[PDB]
Amino acid sequence: AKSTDEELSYTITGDNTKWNENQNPRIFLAMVLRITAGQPEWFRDLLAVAPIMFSNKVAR
Partner 1 sequence: RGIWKTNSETGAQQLNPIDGPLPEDNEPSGYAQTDCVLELIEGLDRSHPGLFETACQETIDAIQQTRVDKLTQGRQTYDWTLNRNQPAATALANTIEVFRKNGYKLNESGRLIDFLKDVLLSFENDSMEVTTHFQKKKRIRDNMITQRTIGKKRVKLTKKNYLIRALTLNTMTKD
Partner 2 sequence: ASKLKGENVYIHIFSFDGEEMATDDEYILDEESRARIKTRLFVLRQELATALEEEFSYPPTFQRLANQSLPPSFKDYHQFKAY
User: What one-letter code names the amino acid at 38?
Assistant: G
Cβ burial 14-35 (10 Å sphere, 16+ → b, else e): eeeeeeeeeeebeebbeebeee
Pick from 1, 7, 12, 18 the residue near partner 1 by CB under 8 A. Answer: 18
Contacting residues toward partner 2, per CB under 8 A: 25-26, 29-30, 33, 40, 42-46, 48-49, 51-53, 55-56
Contacting residues toward partner 1, per CB under 8 A: 17-18, 21-24, 26-27, 30-31, 34-37, 39-40, 43, 46-47, 49, 53, 55-60
